[PDB]
RNA sequence: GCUGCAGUUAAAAAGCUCGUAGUUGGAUCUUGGAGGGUGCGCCGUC
RNA sequence: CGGGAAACCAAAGUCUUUGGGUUCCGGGGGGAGUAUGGUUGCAAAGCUGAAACUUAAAGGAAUUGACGGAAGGGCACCACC
């Protein structure tokens, strides 16, 4: 509204979080102490305003990755998730079903393969 | 319709070379086109050409390198008087040194250098460089 | 070699040389093309009467003459 | 002179080769058609002993909310006397900057001129190989080779550019609104630059050419940074 | 560019397109060539020793540089039945 | 042939290619690409010439060797299907990278923080990667490229016809390039086969 | 403004077509060896 | 590609590197499609078409504000509610 955090604040929040994630927390009261340790901030109101917005972020991050923030731990988590692979899906099950011509595609490609025919009808533009 | 046939052949060429083309098919050809293509050839401005024989008027394929900035045709074919040749080459040639005005004289279709040496003159066909 | 070019070229040159204005390699037409005003200006009295002591000034020279 | 030379440091590999005394003439750049982005490159290779003449000052303007604005535009030309020239137009808040920037712009744009013989080629080229023309927004300048002593027959502004380019003798014909100076100089600038583009029969034959100083000097042009 | 006594004047001799035999001139930096490696026959083993082609701004802007290379590479190898 | 033998086709490869469904080619030809085309399948689709796709790829590979400093060949993709793909190519061969939003002023413009002076660009979609292809033509840098049958030929010298509609076709072709360049002026030796599974190139993507 | 102008919007293509004078007109009829001029030190170059 | 002052234009391209055929109209703006003679017309009017004098810009295109009882616009009790 009337309180829209400005870049000087919002930047610091992205900033700290990038280099501070495992240190920071869920709770306003503690990061505020942390900002004293890990940063030099000139007025107390700013440091508070910073601690506060970065906490609002931590609250959000800890519920779903947030649009522009990266930390070593989140990278590791995505990395592990990005492994998955089952019985596997194609199979495709005995025998490919072709659309023919695609049958004539193999037939005139010198290539054996599994088979099935169901490819007829034209065929309007739009 | 058609008044001249040379002018088309020359233009066709010029646009071929401008595109970056290395060949053209001109139509329909004539003794005069051959003679002009020939003077060009002697000098390097084109490669070899070939007259294909439709049972009509002919079609030529010219293979061109890329030494050709421009080959123009002068219309009408003005009469030139030996000291109007000096005036022509200056009007339309890049440096005194090179480029040819090609005209038709009683003693043959020739570049003006050959003209100066024979010591004959006539009516102006065109040019190149 | 053109009787007109030969007969008058050589003459222009020979005329240009008698006055010292011009020199031999020049002393062909190809060189006059590459020439200038001083070359004439240098041949007037006034500057000569200086040029051998008998004036000691392009000044003195003109009033002397 | 003594004022304390700056500390140019190069952004560009082309530059490193130049400072290192690895590239020695602009020709290398020109043959390679390397683009030149650091003005000092031009400054080190030539330009040393290259003189810049300011062609024009005329002011302009555009409209603000609360009324007006006005600023200075400078037209600068640079060139030795032999075979190199550039042209730069700038508009800035202050004359000095406008000129200072213009010079920089001119240098970046420096262009080759091919100067030739009216016909009998004795004692080195006095004019131009052929006739080249250039057009800029309705002004067009045509340069024509001329005999010795002809000199530059052009308008004062054009004569000045051609002079720096190092042309001794040339005939000119100009068509269009010659009055609009920025356009006229620009066209003439295009005209002169076109000489390299002309292919004469002398040029007809080809060449292992070059490997490019960028490639040979490659290590040299990746210093020890990043 | 000879002078009087067979001397070579002005200042440079430009490279010429590999496709159109037209001067690369000199500030047209929308153009470049292409060094192809020679191979120590047999196969692999990049051995120098460039086989090289230069293509003009024009050809490239006209949506050639590629083919031109192929007329260029095959005609002089490698590249066959292209 | 050319460079003399072994270097020819190899069924093993023509097998990986057909498998990865490269040759399938776009319904819209485009004129400059007509040569690649082998034949048009019924029910509209074109069959690219794998033999041709092959040889050009090798020609590409060779141009990538001959650059001395391998780092300064830029492999480029904003397309997803080609993002892990190029990242892998850069890992193996020297080759520095440019994925995603190319960032304009990267070739022109010293000042910038992604300023690169490559000696060779390899692009995966000339339509998606048009910015890099344009910037490159502002500064005399040759271009290899991923082209399906209907891709922009402007400012690209060397095409390798693909499919780039996608799948593993983009994977395999980047794979085979790196495979090829490591062979040449590299050190694979014995234009014999891969310890690397080509899947390693290939797009990732999402999660439930 | 022949050489060497402009006419979509700046001053300027007739609303349109037929049409005589005038201008303008497709292809195609034959195919080194030495003599003489001017440069360079008996040789040659053009 | 190339053209053009640009807006634009595959023709308004192939135009200083100015030359394919032919036809027509224009030479700062106003006076003026006016005067005057001829011609055609029943008439209304049409075609051909000046000058004296007047005057230093007329005009084109693009760019930008300012401004609108143009469109999406907003914002404030120095505006309304």
Keywords:
part of a larger assembly; 6 chains; A: 126 residues; mainly alpha; Diphtheria Toxin Repressor, domain 2; 47% helix; elongated; C: 65 residues; RNA-binding; structural constituent of ribosome (chain D)
Number of beta strands of chain C: 0
Largest sheet descriptor of chain C: none
CATH superfamily of chain E: Ribosomal protein S21
Query: Quick one: CATH class of chain E?
Result: Alpha Beta
End-to-end CA span of chain E:
40 Å
Structural class estimated from helices and strands of chain E: alpha+beta
- Percentage of residues in strands of chain C: under 5%
Strands of chain E, count: 4
**Strand line-up of the largest beta sheet of chain E:** 1-2
Number of helices of chain E: 2
> Portion of residues in helices of chain C?
55-70%
Overall body shape of chain C: elongated
Largest sheet of chain E: 2 strands, antiparallel
Helix/sheet category of chain C: mainly alpha
What sort of overall outline of chain E do the alpha carbons produce when their principal axes are compared? extended
CATH architecture name of chain E? 2-Layer Sandwich
**Range of helix content of chain E:** 10-25%
**CATH fold node name of chain E:** Hypothetical Cytosolic Protein, Chain: A
What's the Cα radius of gyration of chain E? Answer: 16 Å
Family (chain E): Belongs to the eukaryotic ribosomal protein eS21 family.
Pfam families (chain E): Ribosomal_S21e
Subunit structure (chain E): Component of the 40S small ribosomal subunit.
Cross-link (Glycyl lysine isopeptide (Lys-Gly) (interchain with G-Cter in SUMO2)) (chain E): 41
């Amino acid at each position: 509204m009337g309180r829209v955090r400005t870049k000087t604040v919002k930047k610091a929040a992205r900033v700290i979080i990038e280099k501070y994630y495992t240190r920071l927390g869920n709770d306003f009261h503690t990061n505020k102490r942390v900002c004293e340790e890990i940063a030099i901030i000139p007025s107390k109101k700013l440091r508070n305003k910073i601690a506060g917005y970065v906490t609002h972020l931590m609250k959000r991050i800890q519920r779903g990755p947030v649009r522009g923030i990266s930390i070593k731990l989140q990278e590791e988590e995505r990395e592990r998730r990005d492994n998955y692979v089952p019985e596997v899906s194609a199979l495709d099950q005995e025998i490919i079903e072709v659309d023919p011509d695609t049958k004539e595609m193999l037939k005139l490609l010198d290539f054996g393969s599994l088979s099935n025919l169901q490819v007829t009808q034209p065929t309007v533009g739009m | 319709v058609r008044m001249n046939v040379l002018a088309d052949a020359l233009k066709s060429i010029n646009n071929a070379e401008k595109r970056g083309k290395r060949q053209v098919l001109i139509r329909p050809c004539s003794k005069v086109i051959v003679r002009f293509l020939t003077v060009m050839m002697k000098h390097g401005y084109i490669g070899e050409f070939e007259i294909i024989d439709d049972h009509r008027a002919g079609k030529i394929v010219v293979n061109l390198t890329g030494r050709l900035n421009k080959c123009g045709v002068i219309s009408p074919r003005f009469d030139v008087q030996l000291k109007d040749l000096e005036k022509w080459q200056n009007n339309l040639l890049p440096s005194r040194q090179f480029g040819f005005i090609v005209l038709t004289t009683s003693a043959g279709i020739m570049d003006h250098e050959e003209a100066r040496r024979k010591h004959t003159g006539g009516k102006i066909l065109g040019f190149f460089f | 070699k053109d009787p007109r070019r030969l007969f008058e070229g050589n003459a222009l040159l020979r005329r240009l040389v008698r006055i010292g204005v011009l020199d031999e390699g020049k002393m062909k037409l190809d060189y006059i093309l590459g020439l200038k005003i001083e070359d004439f200006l240098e041949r007037r009295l006034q500057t000569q009467v200086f040029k051998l002591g008998l004036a000691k000034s392009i000044h003195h020279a003109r009033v002397l003459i | 002179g003594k004022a304390g030379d700056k500390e140019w440091l190069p952004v560009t590999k082309l530059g490193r080769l130049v400072k290192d005394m690895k590239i020695k003439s602009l020709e290398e750049i020109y043959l390679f058609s390397l683009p030149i982005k650091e003005s000092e490159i031009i400054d080190f290779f030539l330009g040393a002993a290259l003189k810049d003449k300011v062609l024009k000052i005329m002011p302009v303007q555009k409209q603000t909310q609360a009324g007006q604005r006005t600023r200075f535009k400078a037209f600068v030309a640079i060139g030795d006397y032999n075979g190199h020239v550039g042209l730069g137009m700038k508009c800035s808040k202050e004359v000095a900057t406008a000129i200072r920037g213009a010079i920089i712009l001119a240098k970046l744009s420096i262009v080759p001129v091919r100067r030739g013989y009216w016909g009998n080629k004795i004692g080195k080229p006095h004019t131009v190989r052929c006739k080249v023309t250039g057009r800029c927004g309705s002004v067009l300048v045509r340069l024509i080779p001329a005999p010795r002593g002809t000199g530059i027959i052009s308008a004062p502004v054009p004569k000045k550019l051609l002079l720096m380019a190092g042309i001794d003798d040339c005939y000119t014909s100009a068509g269009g609104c010659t009055a609009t100076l920025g356009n006229f100089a620009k066209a003439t600038f295009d005209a002169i630059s076109k000489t390299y583009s002309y292919l004469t029969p002398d040029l007809w034959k080809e060449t292992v050419f070059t490997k490019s100083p960028y490639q040979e000097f490659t290590d040299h042009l990746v210093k020890t940074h990043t | 560019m000879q002078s009087n006594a067979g001397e070579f004047v002005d200042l440079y001799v430009p490279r010429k397109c590999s496709a159109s035999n037209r001067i690369i001139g000199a500030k047209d930096h929308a153009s470049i060539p292409m060094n192809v490696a020679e191979v120590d026959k047999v196969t692999g083993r990049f051995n120098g020793q460039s086989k090289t082609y230069a293509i003009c701004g024009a050809i490239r802007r006209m949506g050639e540089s590629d083919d031109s290379i192929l007329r260029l590479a095959k005609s002089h190898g490698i590249v066959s039945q292209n | 042939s050319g460079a003399l033998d072994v270097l020819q086709m190899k069924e093993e490869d023509v097998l990986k290619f057909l498998a990865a469904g490269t040759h399938l080619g776009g319904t819209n030809l485009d004129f400059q690409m007509e040569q690649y085309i082998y034949k048009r399948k019924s029910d509209g689709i074109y069959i690219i010439n794998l033999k041709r796709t092959w040889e050009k790829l090798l020609l590409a590979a060779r141009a990538i060797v001959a650059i001395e400093n391998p780092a300064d060949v830029s492999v480029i993709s904003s397309r997803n299907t080609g993002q892990r793909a190029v990242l892998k190519f850069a890992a193996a061969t020297g080759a520095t990278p440019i994925a995603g939003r190319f960032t304009p002023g990267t070739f022109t413009n010293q000042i910038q923080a992604a300023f690169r002076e490559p000696r060779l660009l390899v692009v995966t979609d000339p339509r998606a990667d048009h910015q890099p292809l344009t910037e490159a033509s502002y500064v005399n840098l040759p271009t290899i490229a991923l082209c399906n049958t209907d891709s922009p030929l402007r400012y690209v010298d060397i095409a390798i016809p693909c499919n780039n509609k996608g799948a593993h076709s983009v994977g395999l072709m980047w794979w085979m390039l790196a495979r090829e360049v490591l062979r040449m002026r590299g050190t694979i030796s014995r234009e014999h086969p891969w310890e690397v599974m080509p899947d390693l190139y290939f797009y990732r993507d999402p999660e439930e």
